[PDB]
Design a protein around this ligand. Structure first.
Ligand SMILES: CC(C)(COP(=O)(O)OP(=O)(O)OC[C@H]1O[C@@H](n2cnc3c(N)ncnc32)[C@H](O)[C@@H]1OP(=O)(O)O)[C@@H](O)C(=O)NCCC(=O)NCCS
Ligand SMILES: CCc1cccc(CC)c1NC(=O)NC(=N)NC
Ligand SMILES: [Mg+2]
Ligand SMILES: [Mg+2]
Ligand SMILES: [Mg+2]
Length: 221
């Protein structure tokens, strides 16, 4: 799998690169996409099948994954997780909450960002400093965006607050060999959480492989 390259039972994952035919949502999930276009129905159904495959590894029976007020997934009791879909990818990573406080993941096509998007998703020091810490000709701008998305998805279940692109400073390193490495997201705003200690730094991993960027953050419980 692609997502295993960005991950450290208590944790499980599943991914697919297409939408297998004949997949259906659970009855509780069907209303959420009753009037949705085909592409949305397909990604929604496939990513939730991945989530149920991953949850099954952790001993959890198949259950619907509904969405909260800010779109966040609703996990079975005692579980945490994250979902992502982009062209050519559906993925789910789930964790046992006693050992895993939060998960955030993201996948994007490994392409340059469209013109204008970089300025909307980055901080000035990231634009200045990140290219030197990253392997050449890789789309560091797209990787930064993915790191911002994994950061928000790991952040939101714990704070239930907005995190803007300007609210976290992300610094990168590259592993000795290959197209992978670590990143650290430092929250610049108050990181108070619903329970437990406040969020300050979130450590994650990034990977470029098979035309996709993957990022993931797994916060220890
Ligand atoms: O990367 P993507 O934007 O495709 O991820 C989308 C997923 O992020 C998740 N998500 C959406 N809003 C979120 C939030 N505020 N916090 C955490 N995860 C969120 C959802 O599970 C969404 O997929 P769904 O709409 O099929 O459930
Ligand atoms: C315009 C951004 C967007 C639109 C729709 C859905 C999502 C996913 C939650 C996002 N991304 C974020 O809001 N990212 C984020 N705040 N990163 C720090
Ligand atoms: Mg998507
Ligand atoms: Mg995304
Ligand atoms: Mg491509």
């Amino acid at each position: 799998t692609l997502v295993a390259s960005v991950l450290p039972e208590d944790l499980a994952y599943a991914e697919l690169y297409s939408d297998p035919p004949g997949l259906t949502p659970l009855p509780e999930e069907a209303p959420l996409i009753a009037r949705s276009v085909a592409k949305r129905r397909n990604e929604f159904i496939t990513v939730r099948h991945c989530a149920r495959i991953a949850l099954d590894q952790l001993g959890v029976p198949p259950a619907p994954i509904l969405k909260g007020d800010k779109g966040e997934p609703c996990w079975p009791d005692g579980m945490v997780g994250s979902l992502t879909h982009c062209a050519g990818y559906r993925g789910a990573v789930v964790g046992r909450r006693d050992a895993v406080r939060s998960v955030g993941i993201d996948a994007e096509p490994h392409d340059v960002l469209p013109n204008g998007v970089l300025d909307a998703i980055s901080l000035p020091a990231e634009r200045a400093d990140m290219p030197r810490t990253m392997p050449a000709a890789l789309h560091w701008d797209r990787i930064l965006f993915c790191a911002k998305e994994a950061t928000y998805k790991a952040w939101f279940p714990l704070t239930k607050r907005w995190l803007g692109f300007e609210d976290a400073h992300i610094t990168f390193e590259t592993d000795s060999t290959g197209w992978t490495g670590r990143f650290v997201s430092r929250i610049l705003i108050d990181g108070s959480t619903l329970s437990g200690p406040p969020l300050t730094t979130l450590r994650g991993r990034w990977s470029v492989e098979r035309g996709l960027v993957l990022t993931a953050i797994v916060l220890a419980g």
